[PDB]
């Protein structure tokens, strides 16, 4: 069906193309031409034993291990694929929680899936499969409270478990209407810590995120992402060292809390250990 | 109403080949030129739909060969004021069968002169339409 028409000059064309590399997409015309580049600049994750999960900025999976030139990780833990609002490991070497239909709606669906075998929606019967409705689900500080959006605005999600899908309107507190943050930062420029309702801050610390906080696997990483720059902390704000580079693209890695791997050309390097620095 | 500071028909070489200061209270042929200069140099054959200079109305025109100046005060509406200015082009044109030119100017002044006194006389516009004139005059 005709979705929409888009107008941007050239009352005269004869070609359109989408790459068979699929890299790029472009449209050709008489008066001239345009190329546009896609990305979900920065895009969601989960960890399960010796394996990385990615959600594409652009590009498909690449969700661990490799074999020849480049390999997008196709597995039963479909990462870079779905229509993501948010992806978070529900730790287990066997579980993930996933929101799909992404976007802004009233609310989306989340279908949470088992690593043993994901599905279109996994079983509501199963609690490593559950799906329900809800717009986004988000971490928040002092680590077990969570945000869920299950209204198109502030629901708090809080559970001891991180196989979690909990719904909590209390903590309704707008003054920031449904948008994006993850230890609370509707561009707070702070990660702000809370419980399940309160109308009085516990506290906010001034530090900042990639709009994600990096936990050393599950949900306790004082290793921090920042969008450009990333900072290394131990759990919570202890600024251990602060990272910056200036290429507005890539990554550097932690094994656990603050194990600093840095990539260095055709050389891949440990930034540092004990009092050491190394090329593995 | 004893309102013409001068009406000048100026060349667009900043020259003035007509000026009558109908009314005046400032002088000098020089200052007149100077005053002229600032504005003329500035308008430089270009004119404006309207122009106010000095809080004073400047209605000025250009032809196809000549620059028309009237100085008056913005203290008396355009439409009329212009009407006289209009009257000036038009009658001269019809009557003569020709409007102003540099050439025209060069052959004889007098007619302008003749007209001018009739139309206006000082700071009071006695008249602003041709016809009356046209009959009235017969030179």
């Amino acid at each position: 069906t005709g979705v929409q028409t888009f107008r941007r000059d050239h009352d005269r064309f004869w070609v359109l193309a989408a790459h068979p590399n699929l890299n790029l997409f472009a449209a050709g015309h008489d008066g001239g031409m345009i190329v546009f580049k896609l990305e979900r600049e920065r895009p969601a994750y989960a960890v399960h034993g010796n394996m990385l999960h990615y959600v594409k900025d652009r590009f498909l999976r690449q969700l661990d291990f490799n074999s020849s030139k480049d390999v997008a990780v196709m597995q039963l833990r479909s990462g870079s694929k779905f229509p993501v609002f948010n992806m978070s490991y529900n730790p287990a070497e066997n579980a993930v929680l996933l929101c799909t239909r992404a976007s802004n709606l009233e609310n989306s669906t989340y279908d949470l899936y088992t690593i043993p075998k994901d599905a279109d929606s996994q079983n509501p019967d199963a609690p490593e499969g559950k799906r329900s409705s809800g717009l986004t689900a988000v971490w928040v500080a002092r680590n077990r409270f969570a945000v869920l959006d299950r209204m198109h605005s502030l629901l708090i999600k809080n559970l001891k478990n991180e196989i979690t899908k909990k719904i909590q309107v209390p903590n309704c507190d707008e003054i920031f209407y449904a948008g994006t943050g993850n230890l609370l930062l509707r561009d707070a420029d702070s990660i702000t810590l809370f419980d399940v309702q309160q109308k009085r801050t516990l506290a906010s610390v001034k530090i900042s995120k990639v709009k994600y906080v990096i936990w050393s696997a599950d949900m306790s990483h004082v290793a921090l992402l920042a969008k450009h720059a990333i900072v290394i902390c131990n759990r919570k704000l202890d600024a251990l060292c602060n990272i910056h580079e200036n290429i507005r693209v890539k990554s550097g890695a932690w094994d656990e809390s603050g194990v600093f791997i840095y990539t260095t050309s055709n050389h891949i390097k440990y930034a540092v250990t004990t009092g050491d620095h190394g090329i593995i | 109403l004893y309102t013409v500071k001068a009406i000048l028909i100026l060349d667009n070489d900043g020259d003035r080949l007509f000026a009558k200061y109908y009314d005046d209270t400032y002088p000098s042929v020089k200052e007149q030129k100077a005053f002229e200069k600032n504005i003329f140099n500035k308008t430089h054959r270009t004119d404006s739909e309207i122009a106010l200079l000095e809080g004073l109305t400047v209605v000025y025109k250009s032809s196809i060969d000549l620059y028309f100046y009237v100085i008056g005060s913005s203290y008396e509406n355009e439409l009329m004021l212009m009407a006289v200015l209009n009257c000036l082009f038009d009658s001269l044109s019809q009557m003569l069968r020709k409007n102003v030119e540099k050439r025209a100017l060069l052959e004889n002044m007098e007619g302008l002169f003749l007209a001018v006194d009739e139309i206006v006389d000082g700071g009071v516009i006695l008249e602003s339409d041709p016809q009356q004139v046209v009959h009235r005059v017969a030179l």
Binding site: - | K42, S48, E49, I50, N77, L79
Partner: protein, 257 residues
């Protein structure tokens, strides 16, 4: 209004400036936007250019639209019926509605003023500075901050004379000493015996008053900063010598007045 609203009576411009006065009443004002928008839009007709400034002014404006306009203006102002003059008039009005006040605007304006420039701002400046003083503006730290900086790299010695004179009086009633010093040094930095000279003269009202740290140091400084170049030498020597000649406390009292 409408009928006129395109140079029927190119007369319409004048009126808004006063003859038909405007400073509005609140719902009434909202209604006005369209008409001004036509002129604002049209940008033409000497009668138009003037009209744009008065209408917009009288009715007032939102911040936002200004923004669009700043660009428009960027091209426009130079000649666009010889926009500069109407604009200087407009500008004189700007300095008045905000003469260093809505300082954010003043600064936005300032940046813009200098920027859109040509040169023709200087004339305007004579007014603008005057406006700021009229308020006796208080976001000076900032206001001054822009002025200082820009003027530095927005040049014209002549401006400096005026401002100097004013500044000359003001000093430590508005503090921020290090900065102010910081500036002052700079002002001098420039050559010209003359440019240099002003920083000392301004200083006399200032010195005398001293500020959040000054008397001791005030005494120390004239010493620390010293110059030859004969008559420039002399200026240092003489001020000193003059200084030399009265109990500096007394010295300050007589001279200052």
């Amino acid at each position: 209004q409408l009928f006129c609203s395109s140079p029927k009576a190119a007369l319409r411009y004048a009126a808004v400036r006063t003859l038909n006065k405007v400073a509005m009443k609140h719902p009434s004002a909202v209604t006005a936007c369209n008409l001004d928008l036509e002129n604002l839009v049209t940008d033409s007709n000497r009668s138009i250019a003037t009209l744009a400034i008065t209408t917009l002014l009288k009715t007032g404006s939102e911040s936002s639209i200004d923004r669009l306009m700043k660009q428009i203006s960027s091209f426009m102002s130079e000649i666009s019926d010889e926009f500069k003059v109407v604009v200087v008039q407009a500008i004189s009005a700007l300095c008045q509605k905000y003469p260093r006040k809505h300082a954010v605007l003043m600064n936005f304006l300032f940046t813009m003023l200098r920027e859109e420039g040509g040169f023709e701002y200087k004339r305007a400046i004579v007014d603008c500075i005057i406006s700021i003083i009229e308020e006796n503006s208080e976001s000076k730290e900032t206001g001054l901050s822009h002025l200082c900086e820009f003027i530095e790299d927005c040049e014209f010695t002549v401006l400096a004379t005026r401002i100097l004179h004013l500044l000359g009086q003001e000093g430590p009633k508005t503090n921020n000493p290090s900065k102010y010093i910081r500036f002052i040094y700079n002002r001098v930095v420039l050559e010209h015996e003359e440019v240099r000279a002003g920083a000392v003269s301004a200083l006399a009202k200032f010195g005398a008053q001293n500020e959040e740290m000054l008397p001791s140091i005030l005494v120390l400084l004239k010493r620390c900063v010293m110059d030859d170049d004969n008559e420039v030498r002399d200026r240092a020597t003489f001020y000193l010598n003059v200084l030399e000649q009265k109990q500096k406390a007394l010295n300050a009292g007589y001279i200052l007045n």
